[PDB]
Amino acid sequence: PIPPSAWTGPIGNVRYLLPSVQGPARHLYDTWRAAARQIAQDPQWHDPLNQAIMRAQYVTARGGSSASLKFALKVTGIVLPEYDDSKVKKSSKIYQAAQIARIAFMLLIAAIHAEVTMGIRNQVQRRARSIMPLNVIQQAISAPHTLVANYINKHMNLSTTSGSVVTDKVIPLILYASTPPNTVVNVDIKACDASITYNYFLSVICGAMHEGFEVGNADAAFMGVPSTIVSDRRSPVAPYSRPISGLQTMVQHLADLYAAGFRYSVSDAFSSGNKFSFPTSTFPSGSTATSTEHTANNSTMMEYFLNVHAPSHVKSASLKRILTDMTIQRNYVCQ
Amino acid sequence: KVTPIVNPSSYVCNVCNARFSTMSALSEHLRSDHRPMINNAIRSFLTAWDDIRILSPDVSSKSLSAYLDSAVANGPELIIEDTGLCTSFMLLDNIPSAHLTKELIGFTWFMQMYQMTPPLPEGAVNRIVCMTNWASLGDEGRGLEVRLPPPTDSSVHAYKTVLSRGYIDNAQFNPLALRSNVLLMLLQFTLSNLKINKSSTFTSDVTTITSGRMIRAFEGRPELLALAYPGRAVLPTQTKNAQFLSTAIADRIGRLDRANLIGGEVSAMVECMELCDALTLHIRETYIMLLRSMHQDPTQIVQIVNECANNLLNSTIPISLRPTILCPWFASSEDLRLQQVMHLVNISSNTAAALPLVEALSTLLRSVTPLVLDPTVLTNAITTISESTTQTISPISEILRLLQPMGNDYAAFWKCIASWAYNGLVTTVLSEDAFPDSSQSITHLPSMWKCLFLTLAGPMTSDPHSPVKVFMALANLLAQPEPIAIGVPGMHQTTPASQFSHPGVWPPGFLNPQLINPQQAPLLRAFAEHIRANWPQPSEFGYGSTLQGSANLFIPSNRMVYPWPNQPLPRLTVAPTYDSAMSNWISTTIAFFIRVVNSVNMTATVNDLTRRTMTGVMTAMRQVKTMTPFYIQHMCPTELSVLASVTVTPPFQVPFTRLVQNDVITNVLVARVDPAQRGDAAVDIRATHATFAAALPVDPAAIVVAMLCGQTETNLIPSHHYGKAFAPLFASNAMFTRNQRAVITREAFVCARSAVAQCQDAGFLVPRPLDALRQFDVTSAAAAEIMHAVNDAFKTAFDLDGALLDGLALYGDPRIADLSAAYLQYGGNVVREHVPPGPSHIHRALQQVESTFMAEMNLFNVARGNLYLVQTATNGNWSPMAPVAAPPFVRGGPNVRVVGRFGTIVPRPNGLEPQLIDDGNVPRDIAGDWVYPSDVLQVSVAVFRDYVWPMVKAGRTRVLVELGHYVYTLHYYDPQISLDEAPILEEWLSKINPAGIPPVPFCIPIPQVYPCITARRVHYAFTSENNNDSLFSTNAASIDTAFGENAAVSPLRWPGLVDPNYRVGTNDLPNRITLYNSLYRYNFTYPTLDGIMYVR
Amino acid sequence: MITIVVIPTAHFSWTDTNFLNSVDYRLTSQPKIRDRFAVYAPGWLRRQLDEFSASLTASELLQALQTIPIPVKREFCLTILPSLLGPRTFLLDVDADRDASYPLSVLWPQLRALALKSRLLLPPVALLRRVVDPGLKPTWSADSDAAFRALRLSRPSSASKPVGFDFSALPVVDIICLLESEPDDHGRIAPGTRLTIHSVPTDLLTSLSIQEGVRYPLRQESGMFVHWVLLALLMSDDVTISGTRRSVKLETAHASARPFVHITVERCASARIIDVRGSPAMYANAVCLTLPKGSYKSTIIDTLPAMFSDLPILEQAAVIDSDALGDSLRPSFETQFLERLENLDPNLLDRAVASILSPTSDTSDDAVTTVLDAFNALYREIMTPAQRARLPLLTQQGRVLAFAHSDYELLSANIPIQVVRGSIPIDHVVNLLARRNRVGGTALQVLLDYCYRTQASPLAPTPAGRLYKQLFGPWLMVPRLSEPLIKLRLVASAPAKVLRAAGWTIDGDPPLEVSCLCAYVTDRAAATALIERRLDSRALVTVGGDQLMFVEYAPPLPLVSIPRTFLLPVTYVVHWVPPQRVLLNGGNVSFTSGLEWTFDD
């Protein structure tokens, strides 16, 4: 585990990793930082069509779980249309995002943390199973964590978003592997969704994204989240109030959301009326826009293994000759 | 329950039923019960622990240096005023005469009896203790202060400020780090005291005490009015204060010359006499002299703002008089250089630092620019060329594939411009994924249009190897038809044009196109003929104002080099013209690739009708009327001149180079350590300096869209469009914040490199007034605590938030702190433009405090001279601090013996006395006169206390304790009651460790008012040098002291009050401190920029 | 005339209250000082800035609002919008943090830097004077009027009186204390150190009746602090030296020679009103405070309702101590931690005590990392499955205040509870040395101190006093409230058919109800707008086979859901409202029911 002395003073909620620690956490901290630097530089955002694609990405991809705007009337008075005069399903696809168009994000992101965040359609007993995706405005506060994970997988995992990518990329790699020239190690990571916690991982990346988003304009909004005051506590003699960008504002709320966990609410119609919401450190399984972060760590943590860890830790002198010129751009493919 | 009113007289341990009269006794016994290896770390954690102090030299925050746009944006507090009176020495009464046991009527008289507060203290011991700002009722005190307790207390926590926490316990001071702790207190004495003296209000003395003198009107606080003015004392009886205050001259009080200017307006500067030391007043007047040094008059600051805005901003000043107008915002050109290197020392020298810094411009650069990109024009220019659709390959369609980014992706052009101000840190590199590969030929069509896009976007990117990559990307692409010779072996012609990033692998044909044969490679010589003739000329222009200065290091000041031959800004309606060097560069590439398309190699493969299409596209691309050739030449150098002084960091430039082999800037270098102190003066400059490795992969496909397709509003007045856009970012004085940063960056740098080199032995050329003091630990980590604590004080006194002086301990040796900068050229030009500090003011102030510390060490609870331990059983007066007799047995005297390094008693058998090893390694007998060094007595203390200290109590030996300077703690007693100093002095011996010593317990009798009978008493400890320099008055409220010393109020402390020969404006400042002086108070108004000028 | 721009602090009360109070309630003390302040904080401009914040960047958001003059008078004009900071107008600093929710709060480092260059920012004590002199302690004011002393009641109530008392609004004094050491044999003293307790409630200082300018004893007979200052230290946000900005944590006793034995409270630095709704706590059922070992949890569990016994603050059975869950097992967790360490190595324990208590820490890859993996193997074996069995005690009662040693067990054992990460400004590492006669001694207290510190997730520890202002804050109102309050409660009614299924001797045809959560209102009419409507949350009530009985809500109820005039307790246990109606319990059957606030008589 990372020692508490290895962290800096807090910048708001997040902390930075000291350079004095140089384990595999540092290469985690330094890959997610530089990938976060290439987004505050990237002018693909503040483009109206690019912002319309990301909001379309949360609605269309998954069927959604809940309506926590009934919970999010607690700080802002909403008229709460039930939409029984429109016959439409009250799932998170349509019933949430239509009501988001009235209220800005900044009057909502300060009070997003819900216990029935996800799992069931705004009622504790229905006929549906407790399922994976969460609120569209808590996916919107998880938006940079998707984007920095997309930049790690951009130069490595050219998936190209095509309907034929198993039969074009996976199948010939399957056939190029197992050939009599090369022997392979099919590396599988079991329970990877329940292996990304704030205790180790989500504290490092939220510190890496926050130092990575320090580049660029500190006075710059992002997707409707304005710049704000952070409370800097790094210097023990000089704490002060810093303006941080909206891209760093989302990481301040994301650190509060990752550390409290993810509130799975079980409301299955199989057992007679068992019903409880509870946190976990487990990511949703089938969310490909969120499970790409597991791809973002799979190539990254194999890269520290094949170059720094295993060429120093292994005792076989012959194997160090093999591990010298192994490279994840040549010798490791992940998805 | 009801809250307690009084502390418990008896403290319980609750472990054992042990009553304690003092909480300090309970604090040790609870600590005693906590105590193998486990309890030692538990006892030490309760021993060396305290966090209540402000300074933390032991907390070494690892890599706290991180530059921020908001860190400089908070300015330091300079204008902190002092409405009260500027003295640092309060006249503290240790022993009131009410504590005297015998009290008869009329011997002592108090002013409290007459409902009046005394001006001078009234007791039986009055010391002058250093308590800063005790009377300072100015606004918003400086944070750090030093408040020494009186000599009756311990007074060592003021001298544990560095090198002392973990090493020695609380009751001691570290004498081998004493010069560090004293001098760091003096820095804490100075920076606590950098205020501005402000006149409060002046009434006439309507009463009869001075009868009309313009008294300082302390309105709401009469408890300081009586202390400000001893001349207005009522003298009822013959108080010994009244013996002194009778000699007070009547007209030495209140204001003398109110230097007013305007009737009705507040005065500029009054000149009044009040109670103030001569030392604080010197610190105040050198602070105004610091504060005037960054002041400019408003006739000249409007010339600065207009020249900073290039005279296109409408800023007017009223021409009239303005009395009190300190507007302190102007560091010189030298001090901005010192912050600019300190900016480059704080940062990480990789690409993590310039990449925040480029977009600082590029956000503001896109905010103010008139150039509106609109790629429909170059699209409409290409899609309206004619092509038969029956072909397989479309040169129209296969190049718009290589043209369009999906997002905007056009701010990368503006990052490419903004890197020209920052070519020292970052060099924008042509993006390696945009080079055509070493697999496709020139017949492969999208590989050729990449080479057009590289050749067009060549001079935009600021990489020094840009034209050799432009030249090679075609020479790669036609390696089969046109072969040439490529440099050293290992780099062939089919090397993929990105590995030619070193000046040694430029091909010889590129340096000299005559080396390429036209009969062999005609198409490739003419591209070496192309680049060497049409690559743009690196011109230059000015920015900022010459009056303010600039933070240019390698460029001459207030200038900026620029990779294009600029022209001044037009004020009429502009139109896209083709006279630019851009249009010279653009038209000649198209004139070259019309030759490549219509060459012989493309003739044999590419069909003739689709060859006309490629010719038709480029000739259409050449004739696109775009504004960016006019923009980069005329309008863009104006806004790189304006935004270079409103962004948070000034431009750090290195001169551009058009294709010179020997002038390629390989490395740009900044060091934290000079090559003279460490023996590195002759080695290569890359080994002495740290190098800025930063790069930006600029995409050339987005440049050509920005370059060849850019337009502007038709009726553009570029003076008006810049005059309207720059107006919201000159209206504030926040532009002048970094000038206030740069002086505090200077004043902290000079005073920290002094404070390190004061504590070394003969470091930099700094004067060493405290060199008499003891300082042993001169290591790197010892001096790292010194610079970190000085850094911890300037961040506290001016209560700023940036990172000044951090990162000078990045390498870990701040004993060598010298800021240099250089850049190496491939020909071997080794420039080394290094920057010394400027003529600072606070470093002159601390140096004067250190000089007058030595004359009055006793005033800061530090006694000088050696220590005497002889048995002196007397009955009369006993003055340890002022020995009236001659000091006995000086070192080297008649049969005086000095103990060797171990402090070793050898035992002798059969009733023979134990012998002591002296300095000459000879065992000599105990009884006699001995000199002990301090460090010998720190380790021989158990041998001292058991073998030679009982020989002192018998009076048959006398021991000198040789040590230079030391904190003293005075102890007082009623001389009527008997006393023996040995329970008081063996407690001093019982805490001497090998690491430190306690302060020295001198026993002094309280001076009595009666000729009373006195007990015979035995004293041991007294000193050699006259160390009684802090005693103000021996006894005040009494009519006359009888038993003790008759040390009345010294008139040497008060020439300004009692001396008739006192001239106004004099002091004996390197000698003793005068406590009543004439001074100057101020009434400066502090205008904003709206209070100076008017900006529409 | 003089315009004073105010930027709101971190927990500014925009509630149904005065704007003057929420910046400095000293201004509303006297009528002649209330009338010297014209206020300008309109509601239309507050709504307008909340939607124009994300669109317009903060560099030119200043450029917009400075161009607006006096919009389309009294002495001082406290306004909410910035202006051109000329000599006639000013700015005020509170020496607090500026909030994140307020849109012009990001404009604070741009306005402050202009005020530093021209000496225009003025302390909040400068508003009380007759003429504006910017800065503390002037030459012309005595600074001794009763309007300066904010430790009195300052008369918050008058004839113009609202509907109900606001328990979300809370007076807070930034107090300046001088810590004074032991006097000499003569009446002499070292100068001592000044300290600023930044955010301590005033009603802790009025009920524990003190004045400022008078010396108080700091110590008890046992060496530990008096409960007066000790509550005021851990109600705080931060403790700094007064002149500077460096935070400081102070020991309790015997850790420093020459200790501090007196406090002369001398100056209220600022007198804000801090809101409660919007706390670090968000759920009315449960909140857990993760404090390190050596924190004074037992001081505020026991001794604070010992100082206030006439009024029900908390329920002792329904507050979970952190040390007690390791004491739940029949062998104690600290007793097994003796047995786990002793079986492996006695030598690494001899040098882990020196590396944890080191001033500077090395990698220590022999001493501490053998302790921690032995700790975590011991922890994962027993503590995480026991915490799952402790799930109904820590979230399923009416209202609980759980305590934890770290952030792990609240999340790893997957219990539904809001975790707040606490840091009190007392150095807890010397408290573990100060306490004695433990089961593992003082050596075991510092090893598993470091074990819970490494176990805790690295995130900013919020000041725990901000949590205690939500809990114990408005319970300091009721001694200065002149009106004896009334009692309310919730109802989860149960049918007799579900209460006769497994067997309960219950007399009566009307349904049996239960008290889920109580709350106190200072009148009756302020609850009449809320006693009528039912609450939109389903509440399932687990009734045990024994006397125990647990309540859960299908929809978690936001703490902010209750109105601002409710005084709900710190912790609360569930009981039947008639105990006598229940007889012959005989088994455990739960049921679901709605909620209605009602009057309890």
Ligand SMILES: [Zn+2]
């Ligand atoms: Zn004891």
